[PDB]
Structure 1
Amino acid sequence: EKKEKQIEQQKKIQMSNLMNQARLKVLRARDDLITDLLNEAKQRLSKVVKDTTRYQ
């Protein structure tokens, strides 16, 4: 009973862990995509700066 209960408990912890890192991966992917969007935005701003009249 001791060893069985220990084994099943560790199984539960491992499963809960795996679910956690799955969630973390998807969330960090989301973060990377939005930061890419921000990088594009600042590049567009740099392009906008070039035109003299509207910049003025």
Structure 2
Amino acid sequence: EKKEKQIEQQKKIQMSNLMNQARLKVLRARDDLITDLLNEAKQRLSKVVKDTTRYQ
């Protein structure tokens, strides 16, 4: 019984940790997408600065 309960507890631990990593993985993917948005914004500003009159 102790060994079986050890298995049944460890396969709660492992699966809970895996779902936790799934959550944080999707959140990190979203963060990467928003950082990609901001980097593109920096690209656009660097382009605008080329247009002197607008930059003026």
Shift of the alpha carbon at 1:42? Answer: 0.3
Shift of the alpha carbon at 1:5? Answer: 1.1
Aligned pair count? 56
The root-mean-square deviation of aligned C-alpha atoms, in Å, is 0.8
* Partner in structure 1 of residue 3 of structure 2: 3
Shift of the alpha carbon at 1:29? Answer: 0.6
Instruction: Give % identity.
Output: 100
Shift of the alpha carbon at 1:13? Answer: 0.2
1:35 aligns with 2:32: no
Shift of the alpha carbon at 1:38? Answer: 0.5
TM-score by length of 1: 0.91
TM-score by length of 2: 0.91
Runs of 5+ unmatched residues, structure 1 = none
Deviating above 3 A after TM superposition, structure 1's stretches of 4 or more consecutive aligned residues are: none
Runs of 5+ unmatched residues, structure 2 = none
- Alpha-carbon displacement from aligned partner over 1:1-56 (angstroms, at most 9, x marks no partner): 11111110001001101101111111111011101101100000001101111211
* Partner in structure 2 of residue 25 of structure 1: 25
